Ligand binder design. Structure first.
Ligand SMILES: Nc1nc2c(ncn2[C@@H]2O[C@H](COP(=O)(O)OP(=O)(O)OP(=O)(O)O)[C@@H](O)[C@H]2O)c(=O)[nH]1
Ligand SMILES: Nc1ncnc2c1ncn2[C@@H]1O[C@H](COP(=O)(O)OP(=O)(O)CP(=O)(O)O)[C@@H](O)[C@H]1O
Ligand SMILES: Nc1nc2c(ncn2[C@@H]2O[C@H](COP(=O)(O)OP(=O)(O)O)[C@@H](O)[C@H]2O)c(=O)[nH]1
Ligand SMILES: [Ca+2]
Ligand SMILES: [Mg+2]
Ligand SMILES: [Mg+2]
Ligand SMILES: [Mg+2]
Lengths: 54, 334, 434, 425
């Protein structure tokens, strides 16, 4: 094994041991998806109210 | 009431185990995909170990050890024996073997040039005396292959000058107890051993399928199968020794060595599900009464006379141990 | 000093956030009224604990935290709890009616109406930061708010804070405490949408916590309080490096650097020990380090013996010196199956904090002299994904409950799109560890 | 504040509705004057779900009483808890509905429905955050069946995003008033398929059999039947009325129980059902009985179908470890009766406050494909008359056409086959 990067301070210490070496969508796009889902809800409600109106 | 599922329709052993479970009246079989089981008789390949032990309120047990394939694949068995300190490159009961990808081909040529120089290649088996014809045959295939020294001096049964191998059935329960079934079987060749004719693969191969397709199948014993009582009597009459002293002590030692070596890798002692598994060990005996390990089978079939006893023993020690209801095994202590 | 903002979303995130900030105050000696006698720089400072606490001129130490939930009952217990004086009303955001265990309702329907308010309140906290390094987000997979609104928030945070790191603490659904049948749907939907916006995510399976509470704490039927006090101890062990002096994992970027070499495979496995009943012998460095390789102590039940490691961090609290860690590691490596991938060093990064773990007075956890949390990025955690994706497949083949999601304006194609991403994620784990 | 608006319509709907408010008022410590007199804050913690707060901390049921004749309502007003109800919430006519769906739905009920929607609106307007509505009614009469489903349709038009829940009493020739009950029920069921999120199917056949066989009541009255219903209604609403984690509101319950929108008809059950009682019940006994067919209120054999979803509610002081234990016991013993393509489809809740006169009880709510037997029964009785157009003149006299009956029959047979589809899947 090999210990490396041993740092010590008052509240503790840290180090590394090696056992072996090796061998986004924009604001516009998000708003678009939110409004498209909103419009699909509005369309489904309008179809219901149309059904109830019949 | 205990519940189990069946997922390998081709298993001879566990088709009988499920029968005995239903015969107790205290076990109930479910559909293949029902996750609410106590016992799974799983498929051979890609058993979903990751989905076991996650059903609230159910103790779940499967008939396979995850990771046991390393012992039951010929290539990985050779690598395991070489690279494991517990077994080591020194290992005396395992034939000198080398893994050849179509890799340790240069270390094989070195030990071969030092040198009887007959080897055998297997994954479709070639037995040759020159290394060039072996390596050419491996590269003609696409699967990873292994070659090992062919046992040029096997113990030959008389009369017949006959080769044979010993199959031992070993059950390892969820506590990693190692149980050796007291009844083994000898798969015997029917033709006299021919040290100058390795092209004829009938007197050199003792498999049941190969001997049932040699014109002496069933001559000396039924189905080329000799059981332990007769073999022990032969050893006493012919060689003034016993099966236990001359062979079985070495068999029990090899079974213990192999299974203890992988125990930390496959044990389910503190796992969220439990495992047991039935293993088929294949041994070879030379003329000096030294036992060699040939192969470990992870999904073995049983001897047709021994199905009833061995499967009941599976229910007794592997299943009812975890699920109690309302010895044919030799416990190999370790 | 660089500040960290914590965001708690939905019931699980909020109740776990409560447990964590109660624990942080005990660890840093902050009283429930917000006063901290050991802090001599009254009204400001750039100490390590200031990463998580701002300060008022009156010497009150205020969490850099925002709580958001779409119904008010859980956050009202924060407004009236032991640490009510800690938080000011702007940090506690409540809606009227929840997402009904429906990802689409949390993400699209209700999330669209509240996202701008949430971001406004986060902006107010960010404006108090001299150098904000990013966000820690606490939420469930299974809840409609924890799944649906979190993923919307994570998208917008990537937009409004492009350079900031985002870490997650995610509660993976377990049927013996779960409240909905559709939690596998919500889990896959939120993982698909969040995957590209999270730099490192610590999954906690309620099944693992539940069984640890039963087995080690002798609690017959654990409650959320029992679960959350254990979870808070693990969370605290993970975030201690941000809150105390040290050299390991001192900023959020180092979590990714030390644990996530491949960006999509950003789900480290956490293992914690010892967990000791307060109603009950002090374990050694070797014993608690050996316990880090027992599945019974993991935050997600899986078998690391049948995967490969990409990284391993050991975080010790209490009486621990490097010599005993190295002696413990040498012993364990000779006796256990620890296989790293070939393109990674077989090594451990060790952090020691001399202060032993704080326990909540009157809680279920005994005070111990040394504890450890191991963070290991192992392919074995893909077992959790395979379990979840399988339950998804069983319901989705019959389209069971899908109408609830479509009825909120989600397209059925988002289901299969999310499921295909998860199938690719399972392929990535297979490509790396087998 | 997650308020629910309660509506009870017609003779059956008002008689079971009055008993329901009688029972839960006692559980919440509310006396017949609307003042609280209990000894636990669990009683008041979610009391706004069903009650408004009046002056002097008086609690008034958020309940609307509807009928097309004054008789039953007069009786309710004279009843034990009669003065508890808001007097403005009594909405009634004089003509009656003559056990005629068309009179309830199209003629007599049409003249009264706007007055009811005015009272619904006034209650809904003072809701901090209305969850939705619960309706109690029979399907075999005229007002509860015909006007009740008219109300559901108009309530949906006005509150499209709110949950609609009903307790619907299904007619049986064993406990019948008129021969036309299968007509009224078939017409109503199609309304419920389209306009309700959750319907508790209460079969008068099952209630009678339980009273006679199990309770040892030789001559059961409607009062005896309503004892089982109000006890069941208290059990199924326990998750809404007390602090809880599971199925705590109407929308969460529907999301957990309804995998396909039309299959929202539940078989309720209750335990214990015992003859007149001091003997302590154990958790194994509660669990076995609540899943027993003889404890279910829909006269359908669960063993003839498969459970899509199940919600179980245990009440009283008992071991949650034992509750979890026995509940997992039942699933893992008869896992063939639960569909496998909905994993973990049985959800359990526990409430500490037991019902009156019991230390422990269990309420069962099942979405089982066996409910098709109930709709098959009604369809057979409908067809036996409709093939000869018998008694149709009562309905064509109110303006209905034979084609509306044919459509209703076709609609309910479609519902039956939809259940059979998922029973074999
Ligand atoms: N460990 C833990 N898990 C919790 C807690 N609260 C809820 N859960 C789990 O979270 C999942 C349910 O999601 P919740 O967080 O309750 O729901 P939510 O985020 O508020 O979303 P909605 O209520 O649907 O709007 C289930 O798997 C619960 O077991 C908690 O306090 N601690
Ligand atoms: N090194 C060696 N020396 C001598 N004989 C050998 C040998 N390797 C293999 N054999 C013979 O070849 C036969 C088959 O060998 P192997 O066990 O590799 O094949 P196999 O896996 O098909 C048998 P099974 O499937 O029944 O376990 C054995 O019966 C044995 O007699
Ligand atoms: N369980 C129960 N069923 C009732 C009661 N009263 C009537 N019924 C049933 O309801 C149907 C008659 O409907 P009813 O409510 O009297 O007609 P309405 O006043 O026009 O709504 C028949 O199936 C009766 O068996 C009651 O008090 N309890
Ligand atoms: Ca300061
Ligand atoms: Mg083989
Ligand atoms: Mg919630
Ligand atoms: Mg009547």
């Amino acid at each position: 094994m090999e210990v490396i990067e041993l740092n010590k301070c008052t509240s503790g210490q840290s180090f590394e041991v090696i056992l072996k070496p090796p061998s986004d969508p924009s604001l516009e796009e998000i708003q678009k998806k939110l409004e498209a889902a909103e419009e699909r809800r509005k369309y489904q409600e309008a179809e219901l109210l149309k059904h109830l109106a019949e | 009431m205990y519940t189990f599922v069946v997922r390998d329709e081709n298993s001879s052993v566990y088709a009988e185990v499920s029968r005995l479970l239903l015969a107790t009246g205290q076990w109930k079989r479910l559909r293949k995909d029902n996750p609410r089981f106590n016992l799974m008789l799983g498929e051979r390949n890609r058993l979903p170990f990751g989905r076991l032990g996650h059903e609230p309120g159910l103790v779940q047990l499967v008939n396979y050890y995850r990771g046991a394939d390393k012992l039951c694949r010929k290539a990985s068995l050779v690598k395991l024996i070489k690279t494991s300190p517990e077994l080591s490159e020194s290992c005396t009961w395992f034939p000198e073997s080398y893994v050849i990808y179509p890799d340790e081909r240069e270390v094989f040529l070195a030990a071969y040039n030092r040198r009887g120089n007959v080897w055998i290649a297997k994954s479709g088996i070639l037995i040759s005396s020159e290394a060039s014809e072996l390596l050419d045959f491996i590269d003609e295939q696409g699967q990873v292959h292994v070659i090992q020294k062919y046992l040029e001096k096997p113990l030959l049964l008389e009369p017949g000058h006959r080769k044979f191998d010993i199959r031992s059935w070993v059950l390892v329960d969820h506590l990693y107890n190692i149980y050796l079934y007291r009844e083994g079987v000898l798969r015997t060749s029917s033709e006299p051993y021919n040290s100058a004719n390795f092209q004829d693969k009938t007197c050199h191969l003792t498999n049941h399928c190969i001997q049932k397709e040699s014109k002496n199948y069933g001559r000396y014993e039924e189905g080329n199968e000799m059981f332990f009582e007769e073999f022990n009597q032969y050893l006493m009459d012919a060689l003034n020794t016993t099966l236990e002293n001359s062979i079985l002590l070495q068999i029990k030692h090899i079974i213990r060595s192999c299974l203890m070596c992988i125990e930390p890798a496959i044990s389910t002692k503190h796992l969220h599900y439990q495992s047991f598994q039935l293993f088929g060990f294949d041994f070879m005996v030379d003329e000096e009464l030294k036992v060699w390990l040939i192969e470990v089978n992870g999904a073995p079939a049983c001897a047709q006379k021994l199905y009833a006893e061995l499967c009941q023993g599976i229910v007794d020690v592997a299943i009812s141990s975890v699920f109690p209801l309302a010895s044919i095994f030799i416990k190999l202590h370790h | 000093m660089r500040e960290c903002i914590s965001i708690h979303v939905g019931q699980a995130g909020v109740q776990i956030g409560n447990a964590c900030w109660e624990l942080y105050c005990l660890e840093h000696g902050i009283q429930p009224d917000g006063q901290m006698p050991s802090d001599k720089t009254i009204g400001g400072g750039d100490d390590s604990f200031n990463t998580f606490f701002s300060e008022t001129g009156a010497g009150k130490h205020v969490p850099r935290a925002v709580f958001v939930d779409l119904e008010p009952t859980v956050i009202d217990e924060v407004r009236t709890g032991t640490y009510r004086q800690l938080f000011h009303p702007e940090q506690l955001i409540t809606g009227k009616e929840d997402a009904a265990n429906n990802y689409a309702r949390g993400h699209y329907t209700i999330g669209k109406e509240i996202i701008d308010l949430v971001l406004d309140r986060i902006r107010k906290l960010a404006d108090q930061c001299t150098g904000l390094q990013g966000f820690l987000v606490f939420h469930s997979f299974g809840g409609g708010t924890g799944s649906g609104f979190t993923s919307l928030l994570m998208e917008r945070l990537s937009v409004d804070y492009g350079k900031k790191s985002k870490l997650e603490f995610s509660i993976y659904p377990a049927p013996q405490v779960s409240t909905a049948v559709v939690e596998p749907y919500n889990s896959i939907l939120t993982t698909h949408t969040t995957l590209e916006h999270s730099d490192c995510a610590f999954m906690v399976d309620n099944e693992a916590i539940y069984d640890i509470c039963r087995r080690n704490l002798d609690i017959e039927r654990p409650t959320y309080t029992n679960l959350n006090r254990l979870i808070s101890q693990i969370v605290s062990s993970i975030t201690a490096s941000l809150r105390f002096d040290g050299a390991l994992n001192v900023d959020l970027t180092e979590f990714q650097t030390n644990l996530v070499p491949y960006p999509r495979i950003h789900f480290p496995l956490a293992t914690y020990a010892p967990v000791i009943s307060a109603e009950k012998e002090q374990l050694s460095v070797a014993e608690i380090t050996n316990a880090c390789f027992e599945p019974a102590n993991q935050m997600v039940k899986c078998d690391p013996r049948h995967g490969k490691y990409m990284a391993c961090c050991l975080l010790y609290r209490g009486d621990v010196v490097p010599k005993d860690v190295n002696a413990a590691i040498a012993t364990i490596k000779t006796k256990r199956s620890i296989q790293f991938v070939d393109w990674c060093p077989t090594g451990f990064k060790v952090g020691i904090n001399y202060q032993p773990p704080t326990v909540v007075p009157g809680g279920d956890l005994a005070k111990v002299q040394r504890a450890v949390c191991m963070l290991s990025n192992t392919t074995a955690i893909a077992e959790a994904w395979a379990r979840l994706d399988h339950k998804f497949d069983l319901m989705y083949a019959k389209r069971a409950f899908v109408h609830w999601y479509v009825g909120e304006g989600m397209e059925e194609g988002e289901f299969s799109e999310a499921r295909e991403d998860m199938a690719a994620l399972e392929k990535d784990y297979e490509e790396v560890g087998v | 504040m997650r308020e629910i608006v309660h509506i009870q319509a017609g003779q059956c709907g008002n008689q079971i509705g009055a008993k329901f408010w009688e029972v839960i008022s006692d559980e919440h410590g509310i006396d017949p004057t609307g003042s609280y007199h209990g000894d636990s804050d669990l009683q008041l913690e979610r009391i706004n779900v069903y009650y408004n707060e009046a002056t002097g901390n008086k609690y008034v049921p958020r309940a609307i009483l509807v009928d097309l004749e004054p008789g039953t309502m007069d009786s309710v007003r004279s009843g034990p808890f009669g003065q508890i109800f808001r007097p403005d919430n009594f909405v009634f006519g004089q003509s009656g509905a003559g056990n005629n769906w068309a009179k309830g739905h199209y003629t007599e009920g049409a003249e009264l429905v706007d007055s009811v929607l005015d009272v619904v609106r006034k209650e809904s307007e003072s809701c901090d955050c209305l969850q939705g509505f619960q309706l109690t009614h029979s399907l075999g009469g005229g007002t509860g069946s015909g006007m009740g489903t008219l109300l559901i349709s108009k309530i949906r038009e006005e509150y499209p995003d709110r949950i609609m829940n009903t307790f619907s009493v299904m007619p049986s020739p064993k406990v019948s008033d008129t021969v036309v009950e299968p007509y009224n029920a078939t017409l109503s069921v199609h309304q419920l398929v389209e306009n309700t999120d959750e319907t508790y199917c209460i079969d008068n056949e099952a209630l009678y059999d339980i009273c006679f066989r199990t309770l040892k009541l030789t001559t059961p009255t409607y009062g005896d039947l309503n004892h089982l219903v109000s006890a069941t209604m208290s059990g199924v609403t326990t998750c809404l009325r007390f602090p809880g984690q599971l199925n705590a509101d109407l929308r969460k319950l529907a999301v957990n129980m309804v995998p396909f929108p039309r299959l929202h008809f539940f078989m309720p059950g209750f335990a214990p059902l015992t003859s007149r009682q001091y003997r302590a019940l154990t958790v194994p006994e509660l669990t076995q009985q609540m899943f027993d067919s003889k404890n279910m209120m829909a006269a359908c054999d669960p063993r003839h179908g498969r459970y899509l979803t199940v919600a179980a509610i245990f009440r009283g002081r008992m071991s949650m470890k034992e509750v979890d234990e026995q509940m997992l016991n039942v699933q893992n013993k008869n896992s063939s009766y639960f569909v496998e393509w909905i994993p973990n489809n049985v959800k359990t809740a526990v409430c500490d406050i037991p019902p009156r006169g019991l230390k422990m009880s269990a309420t069962f709510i099942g979405n089982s494909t066996a409910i098709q037997e109930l709709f098959k029964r009604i369809s057979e009785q409908f067809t036996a008359m409709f093939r000869r157009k018998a008694f149709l003149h009562w309905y064509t006299g109110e303006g209905m056409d034979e084609m509306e009956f044919t459509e209703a029959e076709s609609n309910m047979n479609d519902l039956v086959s939809e259940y059979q589809q998922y029973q074999d899947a």
